[PDB]
Amino acid sequence: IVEGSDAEIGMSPWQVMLFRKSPQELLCGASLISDRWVLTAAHCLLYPPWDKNFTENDLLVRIGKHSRTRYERNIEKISMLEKIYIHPRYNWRENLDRDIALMKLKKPVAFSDYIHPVCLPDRETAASLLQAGYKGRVTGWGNLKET
Amino acid sequence: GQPSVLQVVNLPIVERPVCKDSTRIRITDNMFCAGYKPDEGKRGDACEGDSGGPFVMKSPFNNRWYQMGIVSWGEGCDRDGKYGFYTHVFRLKKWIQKVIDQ
């Protein structure tokens, strides 16, 4: 996030960190939508032009985090992936059209003060809030600057 | 370069005509862009590493947080005249429900 601010504790309990096993590094952000489903961008898991085609075993999802690098003992929860589902029409060849993917957790994650799912909008919700001028919020552990 | 803790930023959704005119990439209805325009002064944008993360809005009706978008792409990060593009979650909800219903 560029030109943003430090999030408050528990401010985004649905924020998920897609963690690469080896080498151990941040892969992408993601979101918790139920006790066993995580939503993310398709290009985080699949992008043939770079030969990226992650399988369930290549990563982990860390939930309930605040600090980027530390293992937040007694707070964060680390889950393994049971299955990955990429939108069949995700367009990695051109413009990343339908850049979306779902990940099912092997075991349900227990909710807490730091772990809680976000809601998905229904038609009326989308229609009324998705208007120019209206503000949303974005969160993440990415670059603080472009370069 | 890398933050020590989770970062956050609130950004306004931008008009389609403006999003389209800010990039050479073909925009589809499954995307939407957000961010401040040059003359608005305020800045902020998602960037490398934020990919996959959520763009959320809080409903003033039931006070719940809804995820409207997913950080997807952008030309540079927080550049004047450029905007962050996000996957339109509602537009792809039938697929989401289809997968979960299994």
Binding site: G10, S112, Y114, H116, Y134, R137 | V8, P12, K58, R64
Partner: peptide, 27 residues
């Protein structure tokens, strides 16, 4: 059915430092 309600905020009726900014934009 408790999606979107943060344990440390909405559930306790506490607001974070900038959520008001979002509310204000929804004119």
């Amino acid at each position: 059915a408790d999606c979107g309600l943060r344990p440390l905020f909405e559930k306790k009726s506490l607001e974070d430092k900038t959520e008001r900014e979002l509310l204000e934009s929804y004119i």
